[PDB]
Structures are given as C-alpha cells and as structure tokens.
C-alpha cells in the first residue's frame, strides 16, 4: 500500500545555512504536502503541490521554498535557516481523495547559532540494587545517557549480542539538563536468576545523530559526527 519516505531523517544546521529536505513517493500520487510539527503539537501546512512541476504556498510559507521536480519527489528548501525553523517536518501524499493523506516518517531538524555545542553522549550503566534482587527477585538495570547536544538520539538494549524489547522502558523524550545538555534514561528489567548468571551480557547503546562530513569543524577537537556509544556489564552471582 501507500508509503512515503523522507531524507534525511535527522539534520543539524546553522543559522544562515542552506537546508534541503527530501520526500519520495511511488504511490502514483499527484498530491504532495510539507507540514511542520512543534514540540509534539500541530501540523501546519508550509507548501503543497498538485502535479509535477508546480508548487503552492500553504499556511506558513515564509522562510521556505518547495520543489516538485517529478511526480515522485517533493523538496522543502530553507535558504537561510533560522532558529525558528527548528522542528519536525512531515511530508505526505494523496490522490484526489485528498482528506486521506499518507505521511512520511518525519525529519527532525535543529538549527543552531553555532555547531561548537554539538556533543555526543556520555553513557553510563547503573547496576541493579541487591535489595530489589533479594526482595522482588528482579533486577532493574538503568542506562543513563548525559552530556549530549542535539537531542537526535535513539537508545537500544542488547542482551547476549541481541537487541531486546521485552522488559525495556526508555524515556519518550530526552530531558534538558542544561541549555546545551540533554539526558536520556532507560530501564531494562530481568529476573534475578538471569542477572545472577555470569554468562549473560547486558549492553546499552545510544545512537547519536550529529554532524555530517560536509560540516566544517575546528582542528581543536574530535568532530561530533553520527556515532554509537555504549556501556555494558555482565551478570554476577
């Protein structure tokens, strides 16, 4: 059935910089749309198109241009990015039945005054309380990622080299500990027997989406590029 893809999925930009968001759709749909969502609310129309090679202004045109090079592709262009354009952008498509719109996965864009604050997370794995283990026969491990800027991260758990989903609960939104520092936490809970086994390997992995290669970066420090940071521990008696 109808699907819509977007790229990039995440982007860190600087004020004054040029940003281009792409959307692709093979549904044979003549109608495409670009919307913005802010702090998990709203879905405001920026630009739309009803046929290849044509584009129309939506409700919030200003600061954006759009391009419809073919039926399949619809681009959103920010010529001079501003702090105000930090948001999640969703592209969609429809046929003539235009009240049913099929949405892409979204692009998280954060515009900054300077890239120097972009920093990967510090990841720590906190081991379960012996009290919990003895009283409830369960072991909650807690992963805490701190010190990261842009909040474009995803946290995953790995047990014995395999990503697990059952028993996992991670914060839906990163928490702002500072102006330039986020944190994210997650619980992985297993049985005492499972935690007490020395064979079992527990690993918390945080994927940080940062700068791309084209972004310029000083000679001073390591460039904060997209990268994975993990903390691990093994079961103990």
């Amino acid at each position: 059935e109808a699907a819509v893809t977007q790229s990039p999925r995440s982007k860190v930009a600087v004020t004054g910089g040029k940003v281009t968001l792409s959307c692709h759709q093979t549904n044979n749909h003549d109608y495409m749309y670009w919307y913005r969502q802010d702090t998990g609310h709203g879905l405001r129309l920026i630009h739309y198109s009803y046929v290849a090679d044509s584009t129309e202004k939506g409700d919030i045109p200003d600061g954006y241009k759009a391009s419809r090079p073919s039926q399949e592709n619809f681009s959103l262009i920010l010529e001079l990015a501003s702090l105000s354009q930090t948001a999640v952008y969703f592209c969609a498509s429809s046929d003539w039945v235009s009240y049913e719109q099929y949405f892409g996965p979204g692009t998280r864009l954060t515009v900054l005054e300077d890239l120097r604050n972009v920093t990967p997370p510090k990841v720590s794995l906190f081991e379960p309380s012996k009290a919990e283990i003895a009283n409830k026969q369960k072991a909650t491990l807690v992963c805490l990622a701190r010190g990261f800027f842009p909040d474009h991260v995803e946290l995953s758990w790995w047990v014995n080299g395999k990503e697990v989903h059952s028993g996992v609960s991670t914060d839906p939104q990163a928490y702002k500990e500072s102006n330039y520092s986020y944190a994210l936490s997650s619980r992985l809970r297993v049985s005492a027997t499972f935690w007490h086994n020395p064979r079992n390997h527990f690993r918390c992995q945080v994927q940080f989406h940062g700068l791309s290669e084209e972004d310029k970066w000083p000679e001073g420090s390591p460039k904060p590029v997209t990268q994975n940071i993990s903390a691990e521990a093994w079961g103990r008696a």
Partner: peptide, 23 residues
C-alpha cells in the same frame, strides 16, 4: 503495588549513583 526506592551505582564512576522509584 509494591512501591520501593533503590539506590543504584555506576561502577565505572566512583561516587556516581542514581535513585530508582518502582512498582
């Protein structure tokens, strides 16, 4: 419900700890 607050430690950091409220 069996509420309870635990203190957890980060072995890679000497005095770093955290509190967990659960159940």
């Amino acid at each position: 419900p069996e509420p309870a607050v635990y203190q957890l430690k980060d072995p890679r950091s000497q005095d770093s700890t955290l509190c967990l409220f659960t159940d």
